[PDB]
Design a protein around this ligand. Structure first.
Ligand SMILES: NC(=O)c1ccc[n+]([C@@H]2O[C@H](COP(=O)([O-])OP(=O)(O)OC[C@H]3O[C@@H](n4cnc5c(N)ncnc54)[C@H](OP(=O)(O)O)[C@@H]3O)[C@@H](O)[C@H]2O)c1
Ligand SMILES: O=C(O)CCc1cccc(-c2cccc([N+](=O)[O-])c2)c1
Length: 315
């Protein structure tokens, strides 16, 4: 099946296109190509600074009648400097305006860490620490719930929440809507077994980000591990007559996850979608899981003292 049922009653495509680092001068064509070759889910965020350009592509394909709005699943995320209850609606509306949509299918709290509001996405003190917000994440959640009730978003969820933070939301006094999704980093070097089983057991769908290990991440070091170059993964790919990237995308799909590989290269966008016609064996799956080393693409030193920094905990 190409879609997974969310706890709001809607279906979410298990494959989507990522847009972090997609240059604004390339992402419009990337999204147009993606829609042309079958993608129906686009993962966006205000902090990526390219939502206007993503929106141009979506709007053209809607106008061209290549796809209907109801067939698309568009996701965006509330940035950390907008956790204050009074800023949440405006942040959502700005994203809607840029994407040229009247609703989002899913809106996520991007990180559990709230930052001081202002123009800067990472407000710093003179010593380089991020300046936190005092807004409780439960209050941010209530503001997210209001977006559902105002028709701006069909579903709400969370991203980069650890199991205790997920539990906090689930245990919120007067909780109105459960998170539909927790979007987290997940790949063979960070397999996330504990957090995934917890979320799934509560009916929360997990989306795997950086499934290829984010080789274009700005802080990549020549000596870091590399999923796409791991000979063990290449061997599994060769056995199945697929590319290493295709194996890396199929892997989370078979764990009942949604997966959102990013590309701006038309050939790779198409390649990455050709993952519905083969199956990894249980042995393949267990072998890939065995490569876990708790290695993360996404974690910032500037946030490690924030009270809600998610990655101190085991999971
Ligand atoms: N919620 C969060 O905090 C969070 C954090 C990180 C990421 N995300 C989301 O997850 C998406 C995916 O993660 P990511 O962007 O970090 O990295 P990724 O999808 O793991 O990897 C993207 C990189 O892989 C390359 N690539 C793509 N397909 C390939 C293929 N078939 N063969 C070889 N190379 C290929 C891309 O190059 P080209 O583009 O040049 O083709 C790019 O350099 C993001 O774009 C974003 O939407 C969310
Ligand atoms: O956010 C994305 O989707 C990609 C940009 C990015 C990359 C790495 C870390 C953080 C980040 C942001 C806020 C807080 C933390 N943290 O607490 O570690 C990391 C953000």
């Amino acid at each position: 099946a190409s879609r997974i049922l969310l706890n709001n009653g809607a279906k979410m495509p298990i494959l989507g296109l990522g847009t972090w680092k997609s240059p604004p001068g390339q992402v419009t064509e990337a999204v147009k190509v993606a829609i042309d070759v079958g993608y129906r889910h686009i993962d966006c965020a205000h902090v990526y600074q390219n939502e206007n350009e993503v929106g141009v592509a979506i709007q053209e394909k809607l106008r061209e009648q290549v796809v209907k709005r109801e067939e698309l699943f568009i996701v965006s995320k509330l940035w950390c400097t907008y956790h204050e209850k009074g800023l949440v609606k405006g942040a959502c509306q700005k994203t809607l305006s840029d994407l040229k949509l009247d609703y989002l299918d899913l809106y996520l709290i991007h990180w559990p860490t709230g930052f001081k509001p202002g123009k800067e996405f990472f407000p710093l003190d003179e010593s380089g620490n991020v300046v936190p917000s005092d807004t409780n994440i439960l209050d941010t959640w209530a503001a997210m719930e209001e977006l559902v009730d105002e028709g701006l978003v069909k579903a709400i969820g969370i991203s980069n929440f650890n199991h205790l933070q997920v539990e906090m939301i689930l245990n919120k006094p007067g909780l109105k809507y459960k998170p539909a999704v927790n979007q987290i980093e997940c790949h063979p070097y960070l397999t996330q077994e504990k957090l995934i089983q917890y979320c799934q057991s509560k009916g929360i769908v997990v989306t795997a980000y950086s499934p290829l290990g984010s080789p274009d991440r700005p802080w990549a070091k020549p000596e870091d591990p590399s999923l796409l170059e791991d000979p063990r993964i290449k061997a599994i790919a060769a056995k199945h007559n697929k590319t290493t990237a295709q194996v890396l995308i199929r892997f989370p799909m078979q764990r009942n996850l949604v997966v959102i590989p990013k590309s701006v290269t038309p050939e790779r966008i198409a390649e990455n979608f050709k993952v519905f016609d083969f199956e990894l064996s249980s042995q393949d799956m267990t072998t890939l899981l065995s490569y876990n080393r708790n290695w993360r693409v996404c974690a910032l030193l500037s946030c490690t003292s924030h009270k809600d920094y998610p990655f101190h905990e085991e999971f």
